[PDB]
Amino acid sequence: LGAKPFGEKKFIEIKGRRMAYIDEGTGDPILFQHGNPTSSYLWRNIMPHCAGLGRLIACDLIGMGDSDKLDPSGPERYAYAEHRDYLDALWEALDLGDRVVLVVHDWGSALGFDWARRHRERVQGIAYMEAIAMPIEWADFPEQCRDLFQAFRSQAGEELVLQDNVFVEQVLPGCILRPLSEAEMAAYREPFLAAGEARRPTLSWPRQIPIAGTPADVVAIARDYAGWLSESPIPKLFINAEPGALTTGRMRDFCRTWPNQTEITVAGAHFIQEDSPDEIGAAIAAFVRRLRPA
Numbered sequence: 648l649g650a651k652p653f654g655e656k657k658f659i660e661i662k663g664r665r666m667a668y669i670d671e672g673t674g675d676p677i678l679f680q681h682g683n684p685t686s687s688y689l690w691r692n693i694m695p696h697c698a699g700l701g702r703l704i705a706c707d708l709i710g711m712g713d714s715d716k717l718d719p720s721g722p723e724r725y726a727y728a729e730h731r732d733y734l735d736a737l738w739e740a741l742d743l744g745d746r747v748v749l750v751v752h753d754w755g756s757a758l759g760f761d762w763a764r765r766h767r768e769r770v771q772g773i774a775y776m777e778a779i780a781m782p783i784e785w786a787d788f789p790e791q792c793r794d795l796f797q798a799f800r801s802q803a804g805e806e807l808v809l810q811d812n813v814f815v816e817q818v819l820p821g822c823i824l825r826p827l828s829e830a831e832m833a834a835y836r837e838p839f840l841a842a843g844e845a846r847r848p849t850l851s852w853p854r855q856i857p858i859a860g861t862p863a864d865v866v867a868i869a870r871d872y873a874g875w876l877s878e879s880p881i882p883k884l885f886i887n888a889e890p891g892a893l894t895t896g897r898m899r900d901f902c903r904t905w906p907n908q909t910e911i912t913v914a915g916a917h918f919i920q921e922d923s924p925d926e927i928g929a930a931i932a933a934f935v936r937r938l939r940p941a
């Protein structure tokens with residue numbers, strides 16, 4: 648459980664914007680994708696567990712981490728489709744080959760599940776945790792935060808997030824069981840220090856969650872990857888959490904029906920990487936060991 652980032656940041660130009668990523672080691676990729684409101688930093692205590700098992704890659708989504716901000720920015724910016732445009736292009740640029748192990752969290756799971764559906768022959772295994780595995784209803788959403796996420800989706804969201812930064816300053820530490828040090832919180836705050844559109848990714852993301860049918864485009868995307876994952880023979884590792892947040896109740900029951908799946912449970916709420924990184928890392932390394940027998 649340490650505060651230092653993992654690896655060296657590297658940069659690739661995508662569509663006029665510089666995108667930042669970690670790419671350590673050699674071999675077939677193990678591709679770790681963060682969601683909201685995090686960055687490659689989320690995985691810093693987990694990626695070392697896979698040392699020597701492949702290329703250890705963690706990309707910063709556009710507008711997040713050390714990847715450039717989009718300008719102009721406004722309520723239309725940083726939707727799922729736009730993130731997928733940038734991330735598809737970066738993943739193409741990284742020359743990943745056809746034995747990718749995906750390790751995904753939160754919106755990283757919506758992006759990674761959809762990429763895997765579209766590139767299924769190229770995916771050797773999928774490890775996922777606190778994921779958006781299917782469209783949901785509000786009743787599925789954690790009770791502790793249902794009102795706040797409704798408010799992000801409303802016109803309240805601009806003040807709450809762009810002015811007050813509540814997703815970074817309150818949702819993120821409130822969905823970690825242990826207290827963060829100032830350096831850890833600073834690494835999460837860093838991309839979003841500035842009021843206004845610098846914080847737009849952390850407001851656009853809750854507006855994309857497929858809940859009660861809207862927004863319809865993301866609902867259709869998640870419908871598609873849910874139906875595909877539930878019948879896919881690709882090896883899976885489900886990293887369950889207690890108490891958990893998002894992958895609980897009926898969604899957790901759904902994920903437990905997926906084929907070719909192993910499971911572990913760790914302590915954590917939503918950003919479980921900060922509570923149990925070594926247990927998560929050890930499960931992923933064992934999974935990759937099995938998929939890549941030495």
Ligand SMILES: [Cl-]
Nearest residue numbers: 683852853856
């Ligand atoms: Cl979100």
Ligand SMILES: [Mg+2]
Nearest residue numbers: 653654655671
């Ligand atoms: Mg080094």
Ligand SMILES: [Mg+2]
Nearest residue numbers: 663664665715
């Ligand atoms: Mg530039």
Ligand SMILES: [Mg+2]
Nearest residue numbers: 803806807810
């Ligand atoms: Mg007021």
